[PDB]
């Protein structure tokens, strides 16, 4: 059920999107469809959005099974996932990503696609391991990382595949805040509470205005990656 993959719950103007897909929350084609459906709903409820995963894991990245099944499937999967990153960055209300543990590859791209990011202290890895396992990074990912990561963490993350612990991921730009595994839900609602205080219309317009460069660049990238990522 798509509603188990990304569950949607609305409470007090916050929509929690909970990804729940097997052992490592892989980003599959169904996951992205679920996400788009959940975000459709979040737009319609005008809600502050909190995206989160399962305990100990945000997401280990794209479904490898789909990725390796064929070049067409890999191409369509990454295009959808990048299109989803672009949609999140252009979302009309604030997106909080509440990371409950590890966030690797596309899972760490989700943190680079949001308005506020919170992670949890502990033995977790956050980073972009694609270069480690043999993948040349796609334009979309390079460009999401370029725009958010601290300049000297950026070549280390993308080019060297450096993995970060939570504090390190906050210093590098994956996270804005590190709390304990137990504080996570509460810290997320507390940031949501502060976002409720801003003007949503001014937020939307400022987000599209600030992010125009990034959004056009992502559209060009998504197309370049289709034609040439492989």
Describe the protein.
There is one protein chain. The protein is α/β, with parallel strands linked by helices and 230 residues long. The chain has a single domain, classed as 2-enoyl-CoA Hydratase, Chain A, domain 1. It contains 11 helices and 10 strands. A hairpin with a 2-residue loop joins β1 and β2. The longest helix has 19 residues. The chain is globular, with a radius of gyration of 16 Å.
Based on the model shown, name its key terms:
230 residues; alpha/beta; 2-enoyl-CoA Hydratase, Chain A, domain 1; 6-stranded mixed beta sheet; 4-stranded mixed beta sheet; 11 helices; 50% helix; ClpP/crotonase-like_dom_sf; catalytic activity; Enoyl-CoA_hydra/iso; Enoyl-CoA hydratase/isomerase family protein
Count of structural domains: 1
> Any guess at the CATH architecture?
Alpha-Beta Complex
Q: What distance lies between the first and last C-alpha atoms, to the nearest angstrom?
A: 32 Å
**If you consult CATH, what is the topology?**
2-enoyl-CoA Hydratase, Chain A, domain 1
- CATH class placement: Alpha Beta
Strand order of the largest sheet: 1-2-3-5-7-10
CATH homologous superfamily grouping? 2-enoyl-CoA Hydratase, Chain A, domain 1
Structural class by sheet pairing and helices:
alpha/beta
Q: Give the overall form.
A: globular
N-to-C SSE series?
Answer: HEEHEEHHEEHEEHHEHEHHH
Cα-atom radius of gyration: 16 Å
Roughly how much helix do the residues carry, as a percent range? Answer: 40-55%
Largest sheet: 6 strands, mixed
List the total number of helices.
11
Family: Belongs to the enoyl-CoA hydratase/isomerase family.
Protein name: Enoyl-CoA hydratase/isomerase family protein
Pfam families: ECH_1
InterPro entries: ClpP/crotonase-like_dom_sf, Enoyl-CoA_hydra/iso
């Amino acid at each position: 059920a798509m509603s188990d993959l990304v569950s949607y719950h609305l409470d007090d103007g916050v929509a929690t999107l909970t990804l729940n897909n097997g052992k490592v929350n892989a980003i599959s084609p169904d996951v992205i469809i679920a996400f788009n459906a959940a975000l459709d709903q979040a737009e319609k409820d005008r809600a502050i959005v909190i995206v989160t995963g399962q305990p100990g894991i945000l997401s280990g990245g794209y479904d490898l099974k789909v990725m390796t099944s064929s070049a067409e499937a890999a191409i369509n999967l990454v295009a959808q996932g990048s299109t989803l990153a672009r949609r999140m960055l252009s979302h009309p209300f604030p997106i909080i990503v509440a990371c409950p543990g590890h966030a690797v590859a596309k899972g760490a791209f989700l943190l680079l696609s949001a308005d506020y990011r919170i992670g949890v202290a502990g033995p977790f890895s956050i980073g972009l391991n694609e270069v480690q396992i043999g993948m040349t990074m796609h334009h979309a990912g390079i460009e999401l990382a370029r725009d958010r990561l601290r300049k000297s963490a950026f070549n280390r993350s993308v080019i060297n595949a450096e993995m970060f612990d939570p504090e390190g991921a906050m210093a590098a730009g994956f996270l804005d805040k590190v709390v304990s595994v137990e504080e996570l839900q509460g810290a997320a609602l507390a940031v949501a509470a502060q976002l409720k205080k801003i003007n949503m219309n001014a937020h939307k317009k400022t987000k599209l205005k600030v992010r125009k460069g990034l959004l056009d660049t992502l559209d060009a990238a998504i197309e370049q990656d289709r034609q040439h990522m492989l």
